[PDB]
Amino acid sequence: VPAGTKVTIDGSTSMVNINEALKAQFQQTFPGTVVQTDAQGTDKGVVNLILGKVDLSASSRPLTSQEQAQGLAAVPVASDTIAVMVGRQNPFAGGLTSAQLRDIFTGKISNWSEVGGPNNTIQVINRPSESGTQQTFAAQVLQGQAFGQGANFQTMPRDATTPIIRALGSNGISYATYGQVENQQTARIVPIDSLSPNQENYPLRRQLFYFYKTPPSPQVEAFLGFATSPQGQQAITNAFE
After folding, report:
1. Is residue 1 part of a domain?
2. What residue stretches are annotated with the PBP domain (predicted)?
């Protein structure tokens, strides 16, 4: 890898830790290289990639046929699960079935008492449409149904988990990649169908990708060659804490 190689990344916030872990090992292994990272959400990365403003898009959902038709390709680098979370201050302590989870996010269930909590309105805190996590949750939970709307639904203006966690309060619910809530010191993870996101049969699972333009640029060839080598796999492993 020549000195002065620059790789630019945008896209998935779920993949921030993977981006940073690969950045760290890449520019330590190859002196004089630069990896620049941003994370405005999967769709924002795809837009920048199609317009040629970044070398790679991190994506937490699969490449679409329309995107592939513009000369894009994808490489999977990891997998994760999507946790459902409430605030540590929320007096609801239990779990949800998949049906209950869908009913909350469609608005059919709107009071915590319907799932065993107190008599309180549920505040649904949703990720914006550029979020690949939102797109995955819609596909795997809503299964063709639309998200609810109305006074008790809020879509955050930024695809970002920490502002969502702050907004949960004592009555809100949302979702995020498991690694960003795993230690439960900032939110409580809600088991789904009596399963927590570390379990193999936990239902909300997906691959994580880098998207790139074909034909690949030299800097993309260098970075993805590293990322898929054993050394790159070890760097990616460092993102899982």
Report:
1. no
2. 2-230
